[PDB]
Amino acid sequence: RKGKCAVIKTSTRQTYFLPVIGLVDAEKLKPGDLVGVNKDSYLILETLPTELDKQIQELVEAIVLPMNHKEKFENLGIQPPKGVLMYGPPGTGKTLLARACAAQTKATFLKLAGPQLVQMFIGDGAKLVRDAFALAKEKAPSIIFIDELDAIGTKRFDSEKAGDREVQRTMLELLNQLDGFQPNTQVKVIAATNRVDILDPALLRSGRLDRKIEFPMPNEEARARIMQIHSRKMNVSPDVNYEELARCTDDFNGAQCKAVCVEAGMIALRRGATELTHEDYMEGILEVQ
């Protein structure tokens, strides 16, 4: 004579009564949907969830070690880092290069950006946080990469009109679901910012953004790295010294530099040469700006 029950809600907006029954439950007993149900017995039988070169070390390790290196975790009693911050001045192309490397992880990738979480109505931010934790936390381990976290991490003094503090209600609600929820061994939160103007000071935690790797201005070395990635497969003639064209790429993000590569892919048809030349990169630079 033990007490155990649950509240049911059908899709046709009809509420009934039934206790917690079924087979052996391990991940069940959570407030979810898409469960088993018969014609009129309304019993629970089956619960189902409803819904490249210069960096290869930090990305691949931080996602494989919390799943494959559990033996060293039990042998050493150490938790792995969770949040990585690919910050720094623009030009590196953290959006297209970080998303391309997330596609190179060979795991599941879920798109999540700034305007994705910010909705016209209120209360939907936590719905998309618990939804990103439905697919990520509930589904198979996926990869989620967000960008432009500094623009929404503004802490103003006059608390009378600021939407970025409601984005700090959803965002700091996620930090409540990371600092408050110790078992963060599942899908992590990968963030990145294009500027260090307004950085959130409350991101100092192992579960939060800990591995803050500083990527400086894309100098000849760094522009040769990200641009060697951008040109590691295409037909590159043995004349691209990358000096003048890598020097002229000032204040140009990876999307604008990819557009420079497209403009290089524009006039080479009528240039007569079937292979991309050296001066076509700087021609694209002086063509976009």
Binding site: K155, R156, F157, D158, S159, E160, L172, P201, A202
Partner: protein
């Protein structure tokens, strides 16, 4: 119910009127016939 308030320095013109409103509501719901033996809160700041 054990609360841990934090980052109150940025929320602390009429910037003080809302602070007196919410705080006077805190007194209005903490000094009367309130269950003080069950509720608990910790406020934190930075400066």
């Amino acid at each position: 119910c054990i609360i841990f308030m934090d980052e109150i320095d940025a929320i602390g013109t009429s910037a003080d009127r809302e602070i007196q409103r919410t705080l006077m509501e805190l007194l209005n719901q903490m000094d009367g016939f309130d269950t003080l033996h069950r509720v608990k809160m910790i406020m934190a700041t930075n400066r």
